[PDB]
Amino acid sequence: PLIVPYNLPLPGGVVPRMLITILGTVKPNANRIALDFQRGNDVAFHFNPRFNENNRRVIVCNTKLDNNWGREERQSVFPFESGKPFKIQVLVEPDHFKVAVNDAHLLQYNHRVKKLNEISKLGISGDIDLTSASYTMI
Ligand SMILES: OC[C@H]1O[C@@H](S[C@@H]2O[C@H](CO)[C@@H](O)[C@H](O)[C@H]2O)[C@H](O)[C@@H](n2cc(-c3ccc(F)cc3)nn2)[C@H]1O
Ligand SMILES: [Cl-]
């Protein structure tokens, strides 16, 4: 329903209590997905499901500053399944992004980029059919 890669503007950046919801379906035989919360060219929060990294499924999270990736954070809980519909919810909290998939808490990612009100775009990329991408305040 939406064209991938998709850019969702986040007007005025993010703020605690802001909830971002992504609905879509993973393609058959998917290889990768990425969500990129961006501050200009920097990536404040990269959330990257990998379906086949050495025959393991893993989510890699990181930050990109001045074109350099930092220290990866890895989660081996892997809630996505090729061919199936999913919901990703990203709740901005004071100290971290809090991510739930299909209504189950998955991970938290501490804020490395601290100018939250400059994290003004979300890019959505990879091997999905994207149904919708939106935000609200809770
Ligand atoms: O850190 C995180 C980054 O990781 C690297 S790979 C990394 O490379 C290190 C040096 O060789 C190595 O040391 C680490 O082991 C290994 O993980 C990815 O290319 C990076 N990426 C992934 C994507 C991407 C684009 C579109 C999509 F739909 C899905 C994903 N765009 N950029 C990024 O995910
Ligand atoms: Cl990747």
Swiss-Prot record:
Keyword Acetylation recorded: yes
Would you tell me the protein name for this molecule?
Galectin-3
Describe, from its UniProt entry, the tissues in which this protein is expressed.
A major expression is found in the colonic epithelium. It is also abundant in the activated macrophages. Expressed in fetal membranes.
List locations, semicolon-separated.
Answer: Cytoplasm; Nucleus; Secreted
Q: Which GO terms describe its molecular function?
A: carbohydrate binding; chemoattractant activity; disaccharide binding; IgE binding; laminin binding; molecular condensate scaffold activity; protein phosphatase binding; protein phosphatase inhibitor activity
Role according to the record: Galactose-specific lectin which binds IgE. May mediate with the alpha-3, beta-1 integrin the stimulation by CSPG4 of endothelial cells migration. Together with DMBT1, required for terminal differentiation of columnar epithelial cells during early embryogenesis. In the nucleus: acts as a pre-mRNA splicing factor. Involved in acute inflammatory responses including neutrophil activation and adhesion, chemoattraction of monocytes macrophages, opsonization of apoptotic neutrophils, and activation of mast cells.
The UniProt record lists the Galectin domain at: 6-136
